[PDB]
Design a binder for this molecule. Structure first.
Ligand code: YHW
Length: 235
């Protein structure tokens, strides 16, 4: 992820097959001729897509040019949350499944994993950063683990918590009204202002597949994340 001063990000395509699949996803959704009602609504929850980009002298070096969802913030507080019961996709090998489940064996139980957060503290005029190991350490501590993101401005930011719930609810509504796509190892990016208040966007589409059914695992995760955020409002 290269943050570009024009309010876009450049995401380098992952190695195959993951990078190509993500390019394919954005191309399907943001097709110039697409009038699929489901996919039209889905665009609302994605970063805007500006097509494939490569350096003038390096056509090999493929990027997606995406909206920087943090652009409109002064001191953005950012959290990435992987959603779903399974982080492996429907065509993973036994080896590959074991790799993925071992990273977070509570994924089935909890249905989401905090990949990281950056939290601005007014207090000290500085950022607090948590990495992959933070979220992977949370057990059924998850409430306190998520709460940490919302400690800003000499308070618990229940405004940002409530905003996040309302925006996730829209994404949840989309997932309850579609059975065309299932999403594995994809994330929600949360942004609020740490200095019309919150951003929640779906990101990371290297394991999105056509489907016949509700994405039950994703829905479980969204529902559970909402339930946790809901409980934080009672703090
Ligand atoms: C820090 C962290 C994330 C961002 C960010 O802002 N807009 C984004 C759009 C997409 C992605 C993305 N897609 N796939 N993986 N990451 C990240 C984005 C900015 C700063």
């Amino acid at each position: 992820i290269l943050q570009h001063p024009d309010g876009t990000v450049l995401k380098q395509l992952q190695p195959p097959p993951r990078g190509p699949r993500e390019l394919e996803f954005y191309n399907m959704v943001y097709a110039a001729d697409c009038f699929d009602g489901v996919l039209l609504e889905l665009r609302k929850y994605l970063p805007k897509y500006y097509g494939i980009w490569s350096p003038p002298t390096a056509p090999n070096d493929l990027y997606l040019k995406l909206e920087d969802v943090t652009h409109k913030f002064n001191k953005p507080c950012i959290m990435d949350v992987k959603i779903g019961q399974k982080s492996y996709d429907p065509f993973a090998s036994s080896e590959k499944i074991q790799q993925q489940v071992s990273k977070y064996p509570l994924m089935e139980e909890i249905g989401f994993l905090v990949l990281g957060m950056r939290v601005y503290h007014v207090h000290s005029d500085s950022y607090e950063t948590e990495n992959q190991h933070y979220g992977r350490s949370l057990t059924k501590t998850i409430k306190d683990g998520v709460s940490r993101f919302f400690h800003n401005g000499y308070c618990l930011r229940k405004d940002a918590v409530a905003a996040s719930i309302q925006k996730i609810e829209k994404i949840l509504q989309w997932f309850e009204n579609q059975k065309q796509l299932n999403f594995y190892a994809s994330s929600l990016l949360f942004v609020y202002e740490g200095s019309g208040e919150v951003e929640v966007r779906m990101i990371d589409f290297a394991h999105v597949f056509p489907s016949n059914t509700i994405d039950e695992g994703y829905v479980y995760g969204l529902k559970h994340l909402i339930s946790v955020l809901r409980s934080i409002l009672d703090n």
